[PDB]
Amino acid sequence: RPESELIRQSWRVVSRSPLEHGTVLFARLFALEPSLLPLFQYNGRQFSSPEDSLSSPEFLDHIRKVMLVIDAAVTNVEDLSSLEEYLTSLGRKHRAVGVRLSSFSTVGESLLYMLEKSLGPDFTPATRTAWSRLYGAVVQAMSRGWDG
Ligand code: HEM
C-alpha cells in the first residue's frame, strides 16, 4: 500500500519519544473531552484537573501502553487482522472501566492532532487519511468489546 508507508514514516517520528508524544495526545484528549478525566481511577481517586493526570505514574504508564498498542498497529499496518482478537478484549476492558466507545473517536482526533503537531508540513492530507484509516480499524476491532 502507499498508505502503509505513510503510516510507518510518520510514526517513526513519534515512536522515538512515545511518552512525550502520548502526553500531547492525552492533554489534547482532555481539552476536547474533559468528561474522560474521571475514568482514570488510580487508587480510587479522581483527577481534578487535567494537569493532575500528568503527575500520575499510573496515568503515564497508561500513555505508554496506548502508544504501544498503536505501535503494534503500525507494525501490523498491512494486515491488522492479527491484532483483532487482542483489540476486542482491549475494548472489553474499556467498557468495564466506563469509557463510552464514542470517546475513542476523541482519542482518534487526539492522535491526529499529535501527529499533525509533531510532523507539521510532513503531515499531509494523505497521511491524515491513512492514519484515520488505521486508527479507525483499531477502534472497529475494539468496538467489538462492546459487542455489536
Ligand atoms: C479513550 C479513553 C481511554 C481511557 C479513559 C482509558 C482508561 C483506561 C483505564 C482506566 C485502564 C485500566 C487502568 C490502567 O491499566 O491504566 C486502561 C487500560 C488500558 N488502556 Fe486505556 N483508556 C483509554 C484509551 C486507550 C486506548 C486508545 C488504548 C490503546 C490504543 C488504550 C490502551 C490501554 C491498555 C493497553 C490498557 C491495559 C489493559 C489491560 O489490562 O490489558 N487505552 N485504560
From Swiss-Prot:
The lineage of its organism: Eukaryota, Metazoa, Chordata, Craniata, Vertebrata. It comes from Mus musculus. Monomer. Homodimer and homotetramer; disulfide-linked. Mainly monomeric but also detected as part of homodimers and homotetramers. Interacts with 14-3-3 proteins; regulates the phosphorylation of NGB. Could interact (ferrous form) with G-alpha(i) proteins (GTP-bound form). Belongs to the globin family. The gene is Ngb. It is an enzyme of class 1 (oxidoreductase). Keywords: Cytoplasm, Disulfide bond, Heme, Iron, Metal-binding, Mitochondrion, Oxidoreductase, Phosphoprotein. Induction: Up-regulated upon oxygen-glucose deprivation. GO terms for molecular function: GDP-dissociation inhibitor activity; heme binding; metal ion binding; nitrite reductase activity; oxygen binding; oxygen carrier activity. Heme b binds at H62, H94. Its main location: cytoplasm. Disulfide bonds: none annotated. This is Neuroglobin. Changing H62L: Improved binding of dioxygen and carbon monoxide to the iron atom. It catalyses: Fe(III)-heme b-[protein] + nitric oxide + H2O = Fe(II)-heme b-[protein] + nitrite + 2 H(+). GO terms for biological process: cellular response to hypoxia; oxygen transport. Monomeric globin with a bis-histidyl six-coordinate heme-iron atom through which it can bind dioxygen, carbon monoxide and nitric oxide. Could help transport oxygen and increase its availability to the metabolically active neuronal tissues, though its low quantity in tissues as well as its high affinity for dioxygen, which may limit its oxygen-releasing ability, argue against it. The ferrous/deoxygenated form exhibits a nitrite reductase activity and it could produce nitric oxide which in turn inhibits cellular respiration in response to hypoxia.
